[PDB]
């Protein structure tokens, strides 16, 4: 008789962290029946990503988000996956990360005796309020959690600190290095490569909040010039365009034929071109933990780093906010082949793509199957 | 413009553990506004102890928890008390002890980014189904709230074993010892009390589950012994009784008129006659935390204990269940007013009465006020 495993996937970007997990668990269809419940308001995208791991749901709740209160989702949320468990009867529930949704997931686990594994679990900021109300959700889920898969030494030690059974707690890596092995293609066909043709591609990534005023324009100014240093080079910038950056952009940028800003890319597309990608620029956390895995050198914009561990690995390198030292560091890369070689060829901390495995012979162990 | 400080009376209990704390909020009226939210389903008790203690709350919920599931009080519950705290805009929310309307209080409170006052927090089980939901409910509440107001050591060691900031950690004392200041007065009648002279007054009570048959046939036997021996002593047994077991205390007993098999006491009714006793026998927690600070020797019916402390501090001694430890004990502390008044006058561990004044202190400090 089977260990019943339900799989939640609350939301788009959770797609791609658990994806690999489930098609894990389906690799063992004697010992595990794979129960996959989707809570997601937005879901062509998540669809998109299910298609591609060979994952039907086997059940859908609508969890409305967009314009709900904290309140309205907590309730209805608690409401719909107490019942889908009552319905289910599953021996454990499998929940990413710190959205409302692992939040409410695990205390409907809870008020029905079922364990819970907390994939992604340990990340402390200790502050309640920023963010809001992740932090919060993640030591909530954290003190129900019956089993903890956390990506680093660092978010491990947090849960250790805490008081939790040392036992429960796996450091398993970065499921989403698990993702690329299935979302990378060997070939693949996507405007952003045909125009860069030989040319070698900085990918730049950015939060438009974060980095409004000086630090934009700084990073204008150093592709600018980046792209005028190297005539083989091409800077693509995925990004929501409003009339603000837009005059930002070709005040500095200019119209010179080597800086595209191109629309958002969805996770496939970004994973394909990242792939193919000779720089990353970025100030993205999860940037800064795949793009490693995939040979890319990646320079953060950002005067201060929550990443130490891909630091000292040297897959990441702090760029700064300030125009000269993101020029200089990525001149370096782009002038160098043997500096942009090592960076490259240095081990990922975060994941060696195998987290799911380990995910799922902790699962195993713990259920003595 | 003063600190808003809302206390929440969830459950019956919480009446004499909660109000001594507002009545020490209501002696700061130029620096707190003190409001006061009832959610409790049982209320004549409750009323009662509010009047005592000259508290009239601002908002009563009923919250109903006869015959309801987890998921519907906290759903409705939440919902109840976001609307209260949208409204009363409270700038700190006091919640006592393991309950789920504490927890939910909370999660009310940090769904508004009002900051949680933890009354009496630390209790660890280590147990995440045991008690159920009790623990887990502490251990939310405990994530969720910025001010921790520890009865003793061991509370405020678990909560720094769980990486809690010390500073936010209070050595309080218990609450409920405040109380008796307020319900226990000198001019004072019961019919029990008429009855007794300057007789020494035994009072006994169990209603431990585990304290059924042979051990209820011990404490009897022992009492009977002792009323023998010791010609000045009455006892007082505020139990209800089947009517088999009542034959078993007359078989035993006798009708000679020095015990007093009654029906059970109501808070006030008990203090006062507490206060009023030279020894008490119990398997009672709380009688074990809070009979000390009247005075009072007590004497356990088990083998051993949960009050830890008190032994320690010579507050409790435990006479076990059977027969001969319990006479022997009891007989001790009859017969050498020595060995009585050093237990009489050891200090309570588990509070000195001014828990509420340290609450009061910790949050005028928090709050730069
Ligand atoms: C947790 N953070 C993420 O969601 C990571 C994962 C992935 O990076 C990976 F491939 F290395 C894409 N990503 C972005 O932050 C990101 C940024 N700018 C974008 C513009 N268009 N798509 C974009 C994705
Ligand atoms: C578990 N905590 C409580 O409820 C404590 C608090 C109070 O003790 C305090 F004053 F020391 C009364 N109490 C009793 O357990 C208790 C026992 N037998 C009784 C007989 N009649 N009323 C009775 C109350």
Redo the contacts between chains.
């Keep these: 008789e089977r260990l019943k495993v339900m799989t939640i996937f609350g939301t788009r970007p959770e797609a791609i962290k658990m994806a690999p997990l489930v098609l894990e668990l389906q690799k063992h269809p004697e010992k595990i029946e794979s129960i996959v419940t989707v809570t997601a308001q937005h879901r062509q995208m998540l669809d998109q990503v299910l298609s591609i791991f060979g994952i039907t749901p086997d059940f859908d709740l609508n969890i409305m988000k967009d314009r709900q209160t904290?309140?309205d989702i907590?309730?209805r949320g608690?409401?719909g996956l107490?019942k889908v468990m009552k319905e289910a009867k599953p021996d454990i529930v499998l929940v990413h990360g710190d959205t409302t949704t692992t939040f409410i997931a695990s205390?409907?686990a809870?008020?029905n005796?079922i364990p819970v594994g907390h994939v992604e679990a340990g990340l402390r900021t200790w502050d309640?309020?920023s963010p809001?109300?992740e932090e919060?959700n993640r030591?909530?889920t954290?003190?129900?959690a019956?089993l903890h898969f956390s990506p680093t030494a660092k978010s491990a030690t947090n849960l250790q600190?805490?008081?939790k059974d040392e036992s429960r707690i796996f450091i398993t890596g970065n499921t989403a290095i698990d993702a690329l092995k299935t979302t990378v293609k060997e070939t693949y066909s996507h405007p952003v490569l045909e125009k860069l043709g030989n040319n070698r591609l900085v990918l730049m990534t950015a939060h438009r909040r974060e980095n409004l005023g000086e630090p934009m324009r700084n990073m204008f100014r150093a592709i600018k010039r980046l792209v005028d240093k190297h005539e083989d080079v091409q800077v693509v910038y995925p990004v929501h365009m409003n009339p603000v950056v837009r005059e930002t952009a070709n005040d500095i940028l200019g119209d010179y034929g080597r800086i595209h800003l191109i629309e958002p890319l969805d996770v496939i597309d970004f994973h394909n071109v990242a792939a193919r990608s000779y720089l990353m620029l970025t100030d993205s956390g999860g940037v800064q933990e795949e793009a490693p895995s995939l040979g890319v050198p990646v320079l953060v914009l950002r005067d201060t780093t929550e990443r130490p561990e891909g630091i000292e690995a040297g897959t990441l390198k702090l760029a700064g906010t300030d125009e000269e030292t993101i020029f200089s560091l990525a001149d370096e890369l782009l002038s160098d082949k043997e500096a942009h070689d090592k960076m490259s060829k240095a081990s990922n901390p975060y994941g060696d793509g195998r987290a799911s495995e380990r995910i799922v012979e902790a699962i195993l162990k713990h259920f003595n199957k």
């Design positions: 904290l309140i907590t309730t608690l409401e107490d205390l409907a809870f008020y005796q309640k309020y809001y109300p919060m030591q909530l954290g003190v129900m019956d600190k805490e008081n």
